[PDB]
Each structure stands twice: as C-alpha cells, then as structure tokens.
A paper describes a structure:
Most of the [name]+ influx into mitochondria is mediated by the [name] RNA Splicing 2 ([name]) channel, located in the inner [name] membrane. [name] belongs to the CorA protein superfamily characterized by a highly conserved Glycine-Methionine-Asparagine (GMN) motif in the loop between transmembrane helix 1 and 2. [name] assembles into a homo-pentamer and displays an overall architecture similar to structures in the CorA family, with slight differences in the secondary structure arrangement. Along the pore, R332 and M336 have been identified as the main gating residues.
To investigate whether [name] undergoes conformational changes in response to environmental [name]+ concentrations, we depleted most of the free [name]+ in purified [name] using dialysis and addition of EDTA and performed structural analysis by cryo-EM. The resulting structures of [name] in the presence of 1 mM EDTA (referred to as [name]-EDTA) with C5 symmetry and without symmetry applied (C1) were determined at an average resolution of 3.3 Å and 3.6 Å, respectively, with the highest local resolution estimated to be 2.7 Å. Unlike TmCorA, no significant structural changes can be observed when EDTA was included in the sample buffer. The Cα RMSD between [name]-[name]+ and [name]-EDTA is 0.481 Å. In the central pore regions, densities for [name]+−1, 2, 3 but not for [name]+-4 were observed along the pore of [name] even after dialysis and addition of EDTA which should remove most of the free [name]+ in the solution. The GMN motif is known to have a high affinity towards [name]+ with an estimated KD of 1.3 µM36, which may be able to trap [name]+ in the pore in the presence of EDTA. The conservation of [name]+−1, 2, 3 and the loss of [name]+-4, which is just below the R332/M336-rings, further suggests the gating properties of these residues and that [name] remains at low channel open probability without activation. While inspecting the [name]+-binding sites found in the HsMRS2 structure in the presence of [name]+, we do observe scattered densities in soluble site 2 but not soluble site 1. However, due to (1) the lower overall and local resolution of the [name]-EDTA structure and (2) under EDTA conditions [name]+ is not expected to be found in the position that is exposed to solvent, we speculate that these extra densities may represent water molecules coordinated by surrounding negatively charged residues. We have not modeled anything into these extra densities due to the high uncertainty.
Residue numbers in the entry:
A (entry chain B), B (entry chain C), C (entry chain D), D (entry chain E), E (entry chain A): 83 to 400
The structure:
C-alpha cells in the first residue's frame, strides 16, 4: 500500500505532521489517484476545488482551510517548512487592510520559494562560470588548463538544466495567466463558499490580485531567463575567443620553428662543404696555409647570409 | 487484391485475429479507400465516426464497439497486443465510479503505448550518448578514439529522428487539443448513439476527460522533448569541449618540439666549428696541446648557453 | 506581341494543343494581363472565377469546364501531360459514388504532380548526400577526398533550394487553408453555376472535401520538410565529426614527429662529442687503445637513455 | 529656418520643382512638424488624409491631387523622377476600363521603385559573392587568397544590411495588410471626397485592389528574402567547406614532413656509427681492407631498412 | 525605516527636492509598499491612477499634477533632471494648438531619455567594435593581437546586455500597445477628473496620440534592435574570417617548413656518403687524385637534384 508523508499547515500557521495512506488521503481530500500522480516536473492544476501544484521535488496540495506538503522528507526542506512558511502563512505584519484568502498566500509562498531556489541556483552558477571563463580566456599560457574544461562542461550542463527549469516555470505560469477560466479556477474559496465571496467582495479576493501576483512571478522568471541566456551567450563568446587564443599562439611557435629551421638548414648547407673537405682523401690543397681559414670564414659568413635571405622569405610571403 | 491483417479487440477484452480484404473491410467499417491509406507517420483523424490513427508502424482504427489493429505482423507487437492491451481494455480494477466509453480507453492505451516506446528510445539513447561523450571529453589522450566517433554520429542521427517523432506526436495531439470540433469528433459513441449519451451524461463522457487525457499525454511528450533537447545541447557542448581538447594538447607538443628544435639548432651551430676544425687541412694550431680542449669546452658550454637564450625567447614572445 | 502555348484538357480527358496570343487569351478567359503575370514561383490564386496557380515551371489556369497548361514546351512535361494527366482527369475507376467537380480533380492532380516532383528531388538528393558523408567521415585516411567536397557543397545548395521550395509550397497551401474565404473561392463551379450547386449538394462538392485534400497535401509537404531538415542536420553533424577526424589524426602525426625529434636530438647531442673528438687536433688520448671503444659505447648507450628520458617527458606532460 | 526641396507631380504627370520652407509646407499640406520628421528608415503612415511614406533616402508625401518628393537632390534620383515616374503617373496605356485614383498609382510606383532597387542590390551582390566563394572553395591551393577575404567580409555585411532592409519593407507592408483600418486609411480620395466615392464605386476604388497590390509587393519582397537567405546559407556552407579545405591540405604536408623526418632520423642514426669511426683515435681496425666497405654498405642499407620500418609505423597507427 | 529621495516636478517645470520616508510616501501617493518595489529592470505599470515606471536606474512615478523621480542620487542624473527635463515639462515652444496633459509629456520625456541613453550606448559600442574587428581581420600578421581579444570579449558582453535592454524595452512598450485596457489606463487625468475630460475632448487627450507616441518609441527601439543585431552578425562574420586568417597563414609556414625539410634531408642524405668516406679507415682510394673532387661534385649536384625532385612531390600531391 503506497503511502504519503503529509505536512499540514492550518490558517493560523500551525504545523502538524502525520502519516496517512494514499487511498485514505484521496477520500479525505475528495480526489482520485489520477489527480495526485505528480508525473510532471512543473505543473499547476486545480482538480475538484483543490490546487494541486508540483515543482520538481516540491509537491503540494492547497485546500481552502489548509496546505499540505507531500513527500518532503530527506529533501532539505526541514528549515523553510518549520521556520519560514508558518510566518508567511500566518499573515503577521504586512498590509492588514486587505487580507486575501489562504489559497492566495499559499500560492504566493510556494511560487516565491521556487523563484528563490532558481535565483540561488543562478547566483551559484554565475560566479563559477565567470571565474572559469576568466582563466582560459587570458592569453598568458600556450594551452588551457585541461582540469577546468570538465568544470566548464558540468557548469554548462547545469546551466542548460536551469534554463529548462525556468522555461517550464514560465510556461506553467503563463498557461494560467492566458486562460481566464484557469485563473478563475484558482479562486478555491469562491466556489467552495459561494455565499461569503459576495459579502466579502470588497477587494478581499478578485481576479486583479491573482493577475498581478502571477504577472510578478512570471516577470521574475523572465528576468532569470534573460540572465541565464546572457550567461550562455557569454559562454559561447568566451569559447570562440579561446578558439582564437589557441590558434594565434600556435602561429607564434610556427614562426619560431620556421626561423630555427631556416637557421639550421643554412648551417647544414654550409657545413656540407666542410664535410666534403673533411674526407680522408687527397684534396690537392693541404699544402696551402690560407685555404682552411678562408673556407671557415666563408662558411661562417654564408651561414648568416643565407639565414638572413631566408628570414626575408617569410617576411615577404605571408 | 490488397489485404489487411486485422486484430480485433472487443469491449470485454476478447482478442480475435482474422484475415479480411481491404475492399470488404471498407464496407464493414463504413469507410473508403482514401481514409485507410496510412501515408502519414503521425496522424489522428476521425472519419465517418471511426477514429483512424497511426503511429509509424502502429496502424489502428477505433470503432464504438471494437478496436482493430492493422498490419501488426513481424513488428514486435506480439507481446503487448495479447498480454497488455486486453488487460487495459477490459476495465479491470481502476476507478469503477466513472467508466468511460471504449473509445476513450482505446485512445488512452494507444497513446500510452506510443509514449512508452518513445520513453524507451530516449532511455536507450541517453546512456550510450553519455558514455560516448564521457570518454572523448577526458583529457588523458592526445587524440580521441576514432571508433567511437561513428557511434556518436549514429547516436546523433537517432536522436534527431527521435526528436522529429516526438515533435510530430506533440503536433498531432495539439491539433486535436486546440480545435474544439476535432476534440468533439472523438466522442464516437455520442454521435453513433445520440440517445444514450444524454441519459448517461452523469460524468461518464464529456469534453473535460478527453481534454485532461490529451493534455497529460501532450505534457509527457513535452517532457520528452525537453530531455531530448537537453541531450542535443549536451552533445554540442561536449563537441565544443573536444575541439578545445585537441587544440590545447597540440600546443603542448608544439612547445616541446620548439624546445627540442632550439636545442638541436644550438648543437648544430656549435658543432659547425668542430666540423670546420675537423677538416683534413692545415689549421696552424695542431701543435698546441690546449686548443682542442678549449674548443671542446667552448662548444659544450655555448651549446647550453644558446639553448637557454633561445628558451627565454619563447617565454618572452607568447 | 507576346504569346502563350496552351494545352487544354476537357472534362472528358481530351487533349487539344493550340497557339493563342496573350491578348486574345485574356478575353477568352475573362481575365486581365495583371492576373496572368506568373511572377511568383509558388502562388495559388482565384481571379474572376478562374484558379490561376503556378509552381516554378508549371503554370496552369483552371476553368469550370477545362484546364489549361501555359508555357509547357521544352520543360520535360511531354510525358505526364499526354499519358498521366488525362487518365486522372477522366475520372476512370476510383469511387463513383461521389464525383467531385472538375476543378477539384485539376487541383488534386497539379498538387500531386508537384509533391511527386519534390519527393523525387528529395529521393535523388538523399542517397548522394549519404554516400558522400559516409566516405569523409570514415577514419581510414589522414585527409578527405577534395573532389567530393565540391559534390557535398553542390548537394547542400540543392538541399537548401529544395527546402525553400517545400517551405513556399507549404505556405501557399496554408494560406488557402487558414482563410475560409480563400478556400470557398476555390469552388469555381459554385459561383459560376449557383443553380446546380444547391441541387447537387448531396456531398458532391463542399468545404469538407477541399479541406481534407489541402490538409493531405500540406501534411505530405510537412513530411518532406521534416525529412529535408533531418538531412541538413545530418550534414552539419557529419561536418562536425569530420572536423574532429582531421584534428585527432593530426595529433597522431604530431606525437610521431615529436618522438622522432627527441630521437634525432639525442643522436645529435651524443654525436657532438664524436665530432669534438674527430677534429684533426691533439686530444692527448690517441695512444690509448680503449678510449675509442669506451666513447663509442657511451655515445650509443646515452643516445637511447636520453631518448627514453625525453619519451617520458611527453608521457608526463599532456 | 529648416527647408525642404519638393518635387511635385500632378495628376497629368507634370513635374514642377520649387523651394518651400518646412513651416509653410506644414500649413500647405495641413500637417504638423511631428508628422514630417522622417526618423524611420521604413515607414508608411497616413496622417491627416496624407500618405507619408519613407524608404531610406526616398521621402515622399502623397496627396489626393499631387505627389511630393522631399530631399531628392544628390541622391541619384535625377533619372527616374523626370523620365520614369511621370510616365507611370500619367496613366498612359495599360487597362483603361478601371482607372484607379492617383494615390493608388503613386503608392504602386513608389513600392515598385523600392522593390526594383532591392532587386538591383541583390543582383549585384549575388554574382560577386558567388565568384568569391567559387575561388576559395577550389582545392588547388594550400592557402586561400587573403585579399578576397576582405571582399567576402564586405559582401557579407552588405548582404546583412540588404536582408534587414527587405525585412523592414516586408514588416511595413504587412502592418498595413493585417489591419483593415490601416488599409482603409490609404483611401485618401474616399475620405477627402465622400460624395464622388459612392458615385464612382463601380470597381474604380475598393479594398480588393489595394489588398492585391500590397500582397503582390509583399510577395516580391518575400521572394527577395528567400533569395537572400539562400545566399547567406550558401556563404556559411562555403565557409564550412573552406574550413575542411585548409585542414585536410595541412594533413598532407603533415604526412610528407613526417616521412621526411623518419628518413633524416634514419640517416642520422646510421651516420652516427660513421662519425664514431671517423674520430682521430685508434679503432684497432684500420689495417683491415674490408671493414670500411662493410660499414658503408651496412650504413646505406640500414638507413633504407629503418626508413621503411618507420614508414610502416604511420601506415599502422592512424 | 527605509527612505526615498524624491525629485518633484510640477506642471510649471518647478523642481523641488525633499526627503520623505517610504511609509509616508505611500500615504501621500495613495499607494502600497507592493506597488513601489521596483524589482523589475523594465516595467511600466499604472497602479491606483499613478503611472509607476522604471528603467534600470531610473525610477519614476507620474501623478496627474506632478512627476516624481526616486533614487536619483549618485547616478549621473544631475544634469538632465535640472537642465533638460524642466524645459520639456514646461511646454515652452512646440505646437500650442493641442496641449496634452502632464502625464503624456512625462511619459514622452522619460521614454525619450531612455531611448537616448540606449542610442548613446550603441553609438559608443559600435566604433570600438568596428575598430577592434578591423585590426584582427587584416591579413598582415601571422597572429592576432592577444590584448585586443579581451576588448572584443568585453564589447561582445556589453552588446549582449544592450540587446537584452532594448528587447525588454520593446516588450514593455508592446505590452501597453497591444492591450487597449493598459493603454487606456495611462489616461490618468481622465479617471482622476472625469468631468474635465468630456469638456476638453477636442483633441487634447485621446487614444490616438498615445498610440502614436508609443508606436514611435517602439519603432525607435526596433531600429536600435536591428542595428545591434547587425553589429552582432558582423562580429560573428569577422570571427569566422579570422578563423580562416589564422589557418591559411599557418599553411604558408607549413609549406616553407616542408620545403626546408626536403632541402635539409637531401643535404643529409648526400653528406652521408661524405661522412662514410671521412672515416679514419682504409678506403683503397686515397691514392687517386680525382676521386675526392668527383665525390664532392656528385654530392653537391645530387643534393639539388633530390631537393628539386622532392619539391615536385608537394606540387604533385596537394
Ligand atoms: Mg614541425
Ligand atoms: Mg638535423
Ligand atoms: Mg677526419
């Protein structure tokens, strides 16, 4: 029998954690097994006057009088759930002239938590990517640190995953924003209690507030998308600059090797005559006392002359 | 006379396989030859109150009282058709409080089978691509394994084909979702029996359930599209990293070759004087007992001195 | 006086070819010179109850009682026009229970001919591109065949032109599909004879059949677009693989050249002492009978020792 | 006081050029300074029953009874304005059965002039780009002509500017086409004279003719956009082919240099023993008359043997 | 207690700067803390008949009778605010026949200031990018200046940020333009004073003027977007040209090094026989007076012959 771990938050901020089976939870919440499947990483749906919304590892169901967190154990949710969420859900402080229903505060808190996690992911990825790209770009080494290439690849993969997460968050919010029926379905207290909504319709709950809230969070996600796209474009531009760094530095060694090759070729060409005169044969010139010094001087001078003439060749032909 | 191989599933899950001609099948189904052409890899159409839908090798026609599978032989469909489809079509288990008509279950089963095949293709492609890219990226070899390049190319081609398949599946579902007339055409039992629909309109069959089903499968296909796009982006990023791996490692050998070229050039330059003094001529210095050792020491020391001076050159010019 | 070469097909499939001037043709067809300009490669328009449609070299005007082909000479249209089009336009065979008007058959025949030509272009381009990319990708040669690069470039240009042709064909069909007024304008016989349409409105001619026909041809063109896009993506991926093939193979020769450079540098370094002892001077060691063999053995052993020590250098520094 | 140079074309094709101030021109035309600012490169607006439209250097205002060209001096407009525009505006020839108002002819003439200039720019850019890419692609040279790279870069920049111009022209036409109010605003004579329009509504001026005219020019601009996009794709493909041309040809020289390095390494390795036996020491073998020839033969044969063995190495290791 | 620095502009252009707390400012403006959060870089909203709009560092709130600038200190706004904004807000000069309300002038002034700042950013970035790309592209150096690569990278990052800023400015303007309710909300004086609007409805304030103003600024931002996109495309094309510059120049040094390698290989091959005859052994040919000169001539001639034969090899094999 599959089971759910449920953390229930009341309208007063009270936190109660219990242990209830899935089949009993369906009857308690007035839902069916197909509603609480949680097979989508980003989904915000309203089934049977219950707001069922999921963000990766954050699965929550919002009821008119309570908020439930499902499958929260061993997911680093032990700090926010018991020290930040009750404060936001209790309604302490803030503007008391227009207290919105519980579902509005629950949706706002969950959306803010997800936007904060996305902002933290981006603000962790950005400095690492910047510090990795600021070292490979620098033209003070012939090659790049091969150890940092794996770090760059992992950071790029994480950035792609973060971009996908922000894109699906934006799509999920925009789906509710565009369709007026979907946005009106979020008014759980209106349909659950159609007699209090008319009496308390003095700005307490209306489509304008939900429109503004969802637009604010969609704009925050759009800002995050713009920042992530800028970071990815920066990664691509830095890689293109590195491609020029490893090619322009190679040409320097090409030129040095070519110059040394000309030098050693001239040296070998003029030492060829020395080897020819070095054979143990009869050259008919061993009696002369000036031929040796003349040959040595000719060799040494012509080596430099041919080296300079060849050095002019690479300066002429580019 | 062209023929069809038909596998018929009744409302009770009974499986009957027979052998009927195309012309007789058109009369039996009340269709024409143009409807059952199956020239599109992904198409879901409703012609003459019959749901004609095709997924690559899966050609099926859904009738109010039966489901037909056409051209199923020799396509690895001998396990699902006779061991999984009857269980899903029989309606055993699940929620008995709202049994939907047969066409809903048939569409759900076919869509789930195609989404499962796409998920299997993706979950087969992903580990191979990851293990191929994790070996070429590693900077422990001067070159990359040329055998794995063909594997990477074939995996990329398969990923492109899978992306096209998921894209056309999403388009086929979204075409039905967007147009309300197309979605209403799926209610085959409503138009076939317009007198039972009104009596059994207590949540048994309505547009909401089909909207939710098609949205669920479109969202599953969208998740698969996101995963495939992430994999393709990872492939491109890994190829860009390999391009830096094969260029930064080349520069290391460039530097080593340049250093050795400077060393051998200095050695040849200082051995030139040894060759000059090695000729079988009169150098006017053979009588001295210290000129040979002085020349040898000068040669050996100046070789290292010129080598160090040239080694400073590549450290100065980057 | 500009002239037109007209091939006229009657409702009975009769083919009559005559020679009529443009000015007289305008009066005969009830059109103006601006209608029959044919300045667009892909255009399907209905002017003055005449369907004027053009596909590159295929210019045709459809009339209620006849179909005209304009400028057909010397364009390889001498086989289809007189051996395939009359059979399709005669209405022989097929379903006789619902004979559509002549304009429907003419539009279907022209659209099918263009889709067949596009399919032939794609099925000619694909094998050549595949066989060209299967040879350069193979890592059995240091370089790639430079002759096949021009073939690849021409095939890529032809693929781009084919993609543009399919894109404009899809756009032309979708323009008619989206606007209901444009699709209703195709019912030439309805507006020409508003008294037979009502009497023969028993499924003979209605918007459903034209919608299905145009959707079928748009889906065929979409399949061709998907295939062409897959081929282009394959071309790009294969080029990226070749870029790794010509860079990883270069590193192999880099390593071999570096190893040989270390070997020859060690050989020169240890032959330097042999050259130093080879001078025609007084080394004060010519009387010893063991110095020569000791020096030779030291040279030969130290050459290999230094070669191994340098070979360890490239294995340590990657 | 800022001034305007105005060229006025009457309904009879008369050309009058005068010199009027901006402030007086505003009163004469019944406009304000904000209307005649001409700060947009591509804009077609109708302000106060006056069609104010601008195309880069072509600024014109269309009035019910006249057409004005503003700032035409020193812009190579001295041929079209006084030798082509009056002929088109006079209405000579053409179809006299349906003469449209003056504003239609003026808009058609200006749009045709701009489309002709864009076509000329494209037909000038295309041959130069083709002839530049047909020389660098050819694999008959080790390198590419560095002089033609600047020509290619300038042609690419000009192609990008032309693509932007055609894109903004298409956007300007489509803005009028999509909104029916904007298209109806072009009927200047209808609003200026609401009593002649009803009497002369027998096909002289209606929305159909303007729709067809703007659609024709939008389709011409779309054809130009397709051609420019094909040219840009061809440029990118040719650059990718050149990248393979400069890398596959480098590998040929790599292989030749490696082969020569093996040859010279074998030569040095076997000449090491000759240098060792060439020292001026006691080798204890000078008395033998066959050791010298044996050593020389061993050297010469082993040089080739080691060269062949090393040549097998690059054939084994790819 | 958080505080705001407010610069208040009256309808007469008077500038008053004071120091008011956020909580008191909310009561004075009739707003709440959630309205004046300024968490979006580009946002234009109308809350409680107050136009709250922000552009990066420019935060302003527009009231029916005054304009407030918030957080203006130490942001280089001390020149425009006190020397340009009062002149524009005073309404001096211009067309006095149709004076629009204060909110129109304030929105126009703020939008013009932001468009001027964006134009200045673009006109500063463009010359630097052009001068940087005009030096690396030039094929007069083997390598590119590594110092200018960092300048190019920083300029590319700044261009990406500018493109994002212009994109979000265009989106913010288009959001107001598309929705008629949002544009009507900008008429602050209409809702604040619903009795003066009807009396002064003689062209003083209507939707047409705001539509034209927002369209003008959206078109200016679109021109800036086109220019920035052209600059980015130019950057990419120039980088692609540099990639050919550093590869075609490398091949020149490849060819020179190969030619010198052939020369030195021929020299070593023919000096091998000189070394063989140079050994201190019995060659049985020392008595001949012509063998030495013959060997030397053969060596010198065959060196050049083999060099030419090898030079033909690279001319044959490309
Ligand atoms: Mg080398
Ligand atoms: Mg050497
Ligand atoms: Mg000697």
């Amino acid at each position: 029998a599959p089971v759910f771990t449920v953390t229930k938050f009341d309208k007063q901020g009270n936190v109660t954690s219990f242990e209830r089976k899935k089949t009993e939870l369906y009857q308690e919440l007035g839902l069916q097994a197909r509603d609480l499947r949680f097979q989508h990483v980003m989904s915000i749906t309203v089934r049977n006057n219950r707001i069922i919304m999921r963000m990766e590892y954050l699965k929550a169901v919002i009821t008119p009088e309570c908020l439930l967190i499902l499958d929260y154990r061993n997911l680093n949710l032990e700090q926010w759930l018991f020290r930040e969420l009750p404060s936001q859900l209790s309604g302490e402080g803030q503007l008391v002239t227009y207290p919105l229903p519980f579902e509005f505060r629950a949706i706002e808190a969950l959306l803010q938590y997800w936007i904060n996690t996305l902002q933290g992911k981006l603000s962790i990825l950005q400095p690492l990517i910047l510090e990795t790209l600021d070292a490979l770009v620098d033209p003070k080494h012939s090659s790049v640190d091969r150890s940092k290439l794996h770090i760059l690849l992992q950071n790029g993969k994480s950035l792609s995953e973060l971009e996908t997460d922000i894109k699906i968050f934006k799509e999920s919010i925009l789906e509710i924003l565009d369709e007026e029926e979907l946005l009106e379905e979020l008014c759980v207290s209106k349909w659950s209690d159609p007699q209090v909504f008319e009496k308390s319709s003095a700005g307490i709950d209306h489509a304008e507030e939900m429109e503004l809230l969802l637009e604010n969070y969609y704009r925050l996600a759009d800002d995050l998308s713009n920042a992530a796209r800028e970071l990815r474009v920066l990664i691509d531009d830095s890689q293109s600059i590195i491609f020029i760094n490893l090619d322009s530095h190679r040409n320097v060694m090409m030129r040095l090797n070519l110059q040394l090759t000309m030098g050693t070729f001239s040296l070998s060409l003029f030492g060829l005559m020395g080897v020819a005169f070095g054979m143990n044969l009869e050259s008919s010139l061993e009696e002369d006392h000036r031929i040796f010094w003349l040959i040595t001087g000719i060799m040494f001078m012509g080596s430099g002359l041919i080296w300079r003439r060849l050095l002019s060749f690479l300066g002429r032909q580019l």
